[PDB]
Amino acid sequence: QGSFYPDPFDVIIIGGGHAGTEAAMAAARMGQQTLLLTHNIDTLGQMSCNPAIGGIGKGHLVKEVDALGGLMAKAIDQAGIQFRILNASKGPAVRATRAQADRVLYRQAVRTALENQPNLMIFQQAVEDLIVENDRVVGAVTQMGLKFRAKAVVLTVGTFLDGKIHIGSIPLSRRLRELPLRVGRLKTGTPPRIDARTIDFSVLAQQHGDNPMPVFSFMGNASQHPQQVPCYITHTNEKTHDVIRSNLDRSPSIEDKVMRFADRNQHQIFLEPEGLTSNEIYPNGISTSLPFDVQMQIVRSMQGMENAKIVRPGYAIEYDFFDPRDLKPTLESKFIQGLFFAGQINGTTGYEEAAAQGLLAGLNAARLSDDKEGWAPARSQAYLGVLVDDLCTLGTKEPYRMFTSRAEYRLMLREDNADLRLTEIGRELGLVDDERWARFNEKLENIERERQRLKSTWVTPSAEAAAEVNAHLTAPLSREASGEDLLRRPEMTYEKLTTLTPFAPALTDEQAAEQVEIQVKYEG
Amino acid sequence: QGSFYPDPFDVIIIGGGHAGTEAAMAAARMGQQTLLLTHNIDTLGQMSCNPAIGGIGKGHLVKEVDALGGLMAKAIDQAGIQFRILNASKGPAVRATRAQADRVLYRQAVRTALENQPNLMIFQQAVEDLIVENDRVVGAVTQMGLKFRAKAVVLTVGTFLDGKIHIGLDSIPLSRRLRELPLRVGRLKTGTPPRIDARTIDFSVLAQQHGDNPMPVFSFMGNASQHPQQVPCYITHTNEKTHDVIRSNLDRSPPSIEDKVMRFADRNQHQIFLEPEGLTSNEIYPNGISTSLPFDVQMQIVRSMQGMENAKIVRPGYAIEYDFFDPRDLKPTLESKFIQGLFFAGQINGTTGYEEAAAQGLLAGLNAARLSDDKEGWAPARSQAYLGVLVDDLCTLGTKEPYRMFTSRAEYRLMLREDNADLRLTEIGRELGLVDDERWARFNEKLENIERERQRLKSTWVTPSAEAAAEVNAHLTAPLSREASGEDLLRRPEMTYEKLTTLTPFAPALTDEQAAEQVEIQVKYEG
């Protein structure tokens, strides 16, 4: 004990981040001795912004993170309340699941799992600085003094201020800024968080989860889900704006989103419930550095909340962060062998990218430790890929704006097939459990077997129940057609096509249906 | 809007303490327009010592806080993973209830409860400073910049810090202004053990201590069911090597176990209690080995102990020093004697039990509110309630009475029991504004319920023959010479109300389960 925890570690994860969690979680499951040092087991799982996981891109990420072994899917499987599916009527590729989260519930699940994970050991401590020998890392020194020996270390930097709070010193810093690493500003903000009791919920418009409910992870089902709920929708107006502009001489915002526009348009606002057990309401998109009175003026002027009382004021922070252009696309910093950077440090914000980077950066470092080799997944393997790339190259995630268009080109990069795409690279890599592995096969055998059995089976306009088929189609059977051939046909859906007597039975595997269908209506 | 949130309040509670809570909860439920400022909503319910509520005297203090209508009692019920009645055979003066909290649960419960309560606006900032006009408070100013006017403020502190934490040897004008008045300051210095991962522990060899069946309930309105699942607690001890380690290591930094030793022998083993940190947590609170001794020391201390040979430490033990003003500059109402309408409750006064702050807050909130609507602080009779005692002492003496003492004094005080705080207090509650219909209601039902039942325990005797002078005289020791009434036969230390009403002269058992048990006590300890 050179003052030196007696035990040595394969991977150190510095920070109880989304990234951190996913990192820690993986390196563990891969088989490594991994230790996670968060300065607050209690904020473990905290959600910095709105209480929501997924949507366009994000969801893709999560679906991916999931197949790869990860957590954040389950997590939000257990703690969402409302499970829309964006772009539902727009054909795979740009279809995206998007859940709301009972913070407490989520938080609980990140932890219970983090805490319950063979090979991961948790330890409450600030990290003082790293210990770097030959421009390799070999552990760090926690601020209490203690020092831990490891072979790779994933800097993270999660849930931990500083950054400056705007509503109107650690050797580990100094060290990095001493190397080449180039350092950016990053301007994340926040709504005044609002009081359910003071909000009039009648004169406002509901929005409800999909039926049946969407599960998020491949492995889960909607039983796992908790109680579900509305989110009420209020809107904006001239008044709102006068205020803003009237107060603009006082510094993603609304003090942004409203200088570049013009009230002829009413910005639509979302009251998202921070959870099954709290009168706190997140007014989605009215984040602000605008001073308190303004915030109120604003919260106050819209419909439903003429008498709203604010519970916690809005405010914006300024982060610094280390431009990731100096990362390898395994994440491993280019300067300090074995030290990777996932998370908000690289300058992204969203929980899902974070989670995803973390999955890698762990996985990678977790390998380095077993003297093996970085995966680096291909910009066409998965969005985890399109991200990391975009990040190391232009160092900045691809605007979501783009996602939609851009997605035509990508097109196999789809929520519905992450498991396919990634889950054996998973298994092979080390990240997938005997019992996910053995289902993902079932979801294969069940697809191959019953997709060849959908061309293997035709209907002549001549055999018995030819006339029963001819009811559903466009211009009844003129050729010995196979079910596949007619599934492709715009009116018909796999569910009905199993109904008709030559193409029964249906398929039990609710998913391998789903996939078979998605595949067939989009393969040519 | 000046610089000044629009609406004024009657009463502002500064700092979402225990004391902090309990005050806000009072003033509000007296219909006062009550502002609860706090730097972090997600901490309401924080138990910073071990995850337990009450026990001897602490118990007492809770059940009073209950009768008076505050939260703690209800909370711990809502979140209790273990219930025991200490001194169960020792007679009512000194029976106490204590319970193990699921840290989260509790925290939930206390939040949800302040969140959902008529007249209380919670609003999350830290406080810069008081606003003072002519030695009267009149408002707080938040960090932010926001100012609130109130008519009375309760200063509280808790939930927060600072501290200089020591683990082995290792600015807000409100602090300044305070000190510029003649306030006698003290340091006071709580610590904490090192919190231990439940997996690294061999529970198979330790013995374990369960709750009471049937299951105690803390508040007077609680029902048994209401309680979470119930786990056991685990018991390992310390021993020679352990100590040998503490001693040899003492030359590092300055309740604690390195103190429980510097003060004894040491075969001389000390029962150490492995307390579940939650129902959904893997951390164990090793209750009794707190420290400021350095990490390895701590590790060695843990690992020396049976069961923990392999244990690994999730959170490291340590100790904090708190500044804290001497409560002798408070009127017996906790109104401060230097700035009026300023009230000091809980730890800012130097107490550091929870219960003890829970009680202080209640009354601070009370007399704060009262002042809001110009009344006169209640200042509770030392003979009325331990609440009474406690507060007296922080003004007489500047300090809480010791628990060491509690069992002797015990029987000078004596009407002051747990089993009867409602009886003692709820009533004074009603008139003070502290009690709720839901309760008032029950209380009086119990109240007549017992009356009615005492009467009829004289309105009923056995003449040594006739009817079932048979059935009866077998249960006793020495059969009745002549007349003896129900109540006479019960004072007899061999006969339990429950068995007394399984007799055809004296049945049928009163159904008001509470009243029933109080009837018993009242009778067996009347004098």
DSSP B181-237: S---EEEE--EE--EEESTT--TTSSEEE---SSPP--SSS--STTS-----EEEE-
Structure tokens at A52: 């929501």
Q: Mutating which of A293, A294, A296, A298 best tests the B interface, going by the most B Cβ atoms within 10 A?
A: A293
Cβ neighbours of residue B117 closer than 8 Å, sequence gap 6 or more: B25, B28, B29
User: In the structure, how many helices (H) and strands (E) does chain B have?
Assistant: 17, 23
Distance from CA of B122 to the nearest CA of A (A): 6
Please report where in the chains the tokens 């799992």 appear, as a residue: A113
Distance from CA of A355 to the nearest CA of B (A): 23
Task: Please tell me whether the peptide bond between B182 and the residue prior to it is cis, using omega within 30 degrees of 0.
Answer: no
- Closest partner CB to B295 (pick from A146, A168, A278): A146
Same domain, B423 and B512: yes
Backbone angles phi, psi at A150, to 5 degrees: -140, 165
The phi-psi region of residue A275 (left if phi > 0; otherwise alpha if psi is between -120 and 50; otherwise beta) is left
Distances (CA, A) of B380 to A280, B337, B352, B363, B364: 37, 18, 21, 9, 11
Mind spelling out the 3-state secondary structure of B444-512?
Answer: HHHHHHHHHHHHCCCCCEECCCCCCHHHHHCCCCCCCCCCEEHHHHHHCCCCCHHHHCCCCCCCCCCCC
Structure tokens at B475: 């249960």
Share in percent of chain A as helix, strand, coil (round to 5): 35, 20, 50
Is the CB of B145 less than 8 angstroms away from the CB of A310? no
Distance from CA of B525 to the nearest CA of A (A): 45
Backbone angles phi, psi at B338, to 5 degrees: -115, -35
Q: How many CB atoms lie within 10 A of CB A108?
A: 20
Residues of A with CB under 8 A from a CB of B: 1, 41, 104, 108, 111-112, 115-116, 121-125, 144-146, 167-168, 195, 197, 277-279, 291-293, 309-313
- Closest partner CB to A311 (pick from B122, B145, B146): B122
Alpha-carbon gap, residue A47 to A101, rounded angstroms: 9
Alpha-carbon gap, residue B332 to B350, rounded angstroms: 15
Is the CB of B197 less than 8 angstroms away from the CB of A145? no
- Closest partner CB to B1 (pick from A167, A279, A293): A293
What one-character-per-residue DSSP string does B377-412 give? Answer: -----TTT-HHHHHHHHHHHTSSPPPHHHHHHHTTT
What one-character-per-residue DSSP string does A83-98 give? Answer: --EESTTS-GGG-EEE
> Which amino acid belongs to residue A388?
V
Nearest CA in chain B to A315: B144
Q: Which domain holds residue A299?
A: 185-319
Distance from CA of A247 to the nearest CA of B (A): 14
Q: Among residues A319, A335, A358, which one ends one of the domains?
A: A319
> Which amino acid belongs to residue A439?
R
- Closest partner CB to B144 (pick from A144, A167, A277): A167
Q: Environment class of residue B384 by beta-carbon count within 10 Å: exposed (0-12), middle (13-18) or buried (19+)?
A: middle
Length of chain A: 524
Q: How many CA atoms lie within 13 A of A142 on its CB side?
A: 26
The SS3 call for residue B41 is helix
- Report which secondary-structure segment, H or E, holds B359: helix B355-372
Helix locations, A302-413, DSSP H: 351-368, 383-393, 400-403, 407-410
Same domain, B180 and B33: yes
CA dihedral B262, B265, B269, B272 (to 10 degrees): -30
Strands (E), B27-142: 34-37, 52-54, 80-86, 96-101, 120-123, 127-133, 136-142
The total domain count for chain B is 2
β-strands A8-14, A34-37 pairing: parallel
Are B245 and B235 in contact by the 8 Å Cβ rule? The answer is: no
Same domain, A261 and A149: no
Alpha-carbon gap, residue B409 to B419, rounded angstroms: 17
Same domain, A353 and A490: yes
Are A216 and A62 in contact by the 8 Å Cβ rule? The answer is: yes
Same domain, A282 and A404: no
Same domain, B112 and B170: yes
This structure was determined by X-ray
Q: Among residues A295, A319, A343, which one ends one of the domains?
A: A319
| Contacts with B124 from chain A: Cβ below 8 Å | 311-312
Q: Is B17 annotated as a binding residue?
A: yes
Distances (CA, A) of B190 to A208, A484, B126, B129, B203: 50, 73, 23, 26, 28
Q: Is B458 annotated as a binding residue?
A: no
Alpha-carbon gap, residue B215 to B306, rounded angstroms: 30
Distances (CA, A) of A475 to A461, A479, B345: 12, 11, 84
For residue A150, which of A160, A165, A140 has the smallest C-alpha distance?
A140
β-strands B80-86, B96-101 pairing: antiparallel
Alpha-carbon gap, residue A68 to A71, rounded angstroms: 9
Structure tokens at A122: 């948790």
Alpha-carbon gap, residue B226 to A217, rounded angstroms: 34
Same domain, B312 and B352: no
Alpha-carbon gap, residue A417 to A64, rounded angstroms: 9
The secondary structure of residue A215, as a DSSP letter, is: P
Same domain, A291 and A419: no
Cβ neighbours of residue A296 closer than 8 Å, sequence gap 6 or more: A192, A308, A310
Q: How many CB atoms lie within 10 A of CB B381?
A: 13
CATH classification of the domain holding A202: 2.40.30.260
Same domain, B292 and B347: no
The phi-psi region of residue B392 (left if phi > 0; otherwise alpha if psi is between -120 and 50; otherwise beta) is alpha
Mind spelling out the 3-state secondary structure of B299-336?
Answer: HHHHHCCCCCCCCCEEECCEEECEEEECHHHECCCCEE
Same domain, A339 and A308: no
Q: How many CB atoms lie within 10 A of CB B319?
A: 21
Q: Among residues B304, B322, B340, which one ends one of the domains?
A: B322
Length of chain B: 527
Q: Mutating which of A48, A279, A290 best tests the B interface, going by the most B Cβ atoms within 10 A?
A: A279
Same domain, A331 and A454: yes
Same domain, A86 and A205: no
